[PDB]
Amino acid sequence: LTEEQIAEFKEAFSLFDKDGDGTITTKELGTVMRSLGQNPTEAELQDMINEVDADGNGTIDFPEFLTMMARTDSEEEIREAFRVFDKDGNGYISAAELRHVMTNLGEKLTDEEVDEMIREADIDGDGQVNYEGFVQMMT
Amino acid sequence: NRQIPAAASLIQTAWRCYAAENPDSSTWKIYIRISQLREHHRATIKVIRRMQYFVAKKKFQQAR
Ligand SMILES: [Ca+2]
Ligand SMILES: [Ca+2]
Ligand SMILES: [Ca+2]
């Protein structure tokens, strides 16, 4: 962690702590998200906080915020998520199959996001994505 | 098979978290209701994207 990183994370913290009270609540979090054009439910906001609220008080103070923003397995879980679609255990997912899953399931990436993903992931350009290589790239 | 949406969302939040580090990634184009995206938008977007990644991480862990 750099001295520059910590100040940048303190600046980011302030954008959420509209209170100035030292903690981010679910309400301040939803306020920021709606300002960006999102409409999260209250349960979605709660799940966001709970993954970060290490003392279980229900809010996020700056050391908790910094802990999460500075954050090990992860690589393996993302591999395991790709392996869900690697039915034959290729180690590979088709660019076509990847675009389909990325665009139409879950968060629904845009086609331009998927373009960027595939251009970076398909190193040899054969239309087949070595997803273990791509997981490495992201981490 | 609830693994499929949870798996997709983990990949997508992870990638979106990675790609927001590139200030000129097309992942910034999704915020259609922001006239001019200033630096304070990007800073909050990066925070939100990290939180969503952690949520997706947990949800995938629970489905597997
Ligand atoms: Ca506050
Ligand atoms: Ca706390
Ligand atoms: Ca390839």
Q: Where are the domains of chain B?
A: 3-63
- Strand, coil or helix: A92: strand
A23 dihedral zone (left: phi>0; alpha: psi -120 to 50; beta):
beta
- Strand, coil or helix: A128: strand
CB nearest to A81's CB, from B31, B44, B60: B60
- Do residues A129 and A98 make contact, with C-beta atoms less than 8 angstroms apart? yes
Which residues make Cβ contacts (< 8 Å) with residue A37, sequence separation at least 6? B31, B32, B33, B34
DSSP string, B8-60: HHHHHHHHHHHHTTSTT-GGGGG-TT-SS--HHHHHHHHHHHHHHHHHHHHHH
Token representation of residue A3: 């001295």
CB contacts, 8 Å: A34 with chain B: none
Token representation of residue B44: 């909050």
- Sequence letter at residue B24: D
User: Which residues are bridge partners to A94 per DSSP?
Assistant: A128
Strand blocks (E) in A28-100: 60-61, 92-94
CA B61 to chain centre: 17
Note whether B5 contacts A105, CB cutoff 8 Å. Answer: yes
| CB neighbour class for A76 (10 Å; exposed up to 12, middle 13-18, buried from 19) | exposed
